[PDB]
């Protein structure tokens, strides 16, 4: 289980085919991969002042 925070535009870009600022320079998921990811909203509980 690997947990982190990433805003709103790469939740579906964490797929193996998609690449960019996150897959090349952050958490990279391999071309073949078995497993499931889980994400939820953080509109106020992880937004702060």
């Amino acid at each position: 289980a690997d947990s982190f925070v990433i805003r709103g535009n790469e939740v579906r870009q964490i797929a193996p085919g998609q690449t960019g600022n996150i897959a090349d320079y952050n958490y990279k998921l391999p071309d073949d991969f078995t497993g499931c990811v889980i994400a939820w909203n953080s509109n106020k509980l992880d937004s702060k002042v």
Binding site: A1, D2, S3, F4, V5, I6, R7, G8, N9, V11, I14, Y27, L29, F33, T34, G35, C36, V37, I38, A39, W40, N41, S42, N43, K44, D46, S47, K48, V49
Partner: protein, 49 residues
């Protein structure tokens, strides 16, 4: 990043946890719920190893 709890919606964060499973390899450690049954050794069965 960083903002007040109301912002331009697209920057609102997300908490992502992955679950990268793996199979084959060593004897298993994670198993899930068990319904284990005693053994027979000379007849056909519907086994689950």
């Amino acid at each position: 990043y960083g903002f007040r709890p109301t912002y331009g919606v697209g920057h609102q964060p997300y908490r992502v946890v992955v679950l990268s499973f793996e199979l084959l390899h060593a004897p298993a450690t994670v198993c899930g719920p068990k319904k284990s049954t005693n053994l027979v050794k000379n007849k056909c069965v519907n086994f689950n190893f």
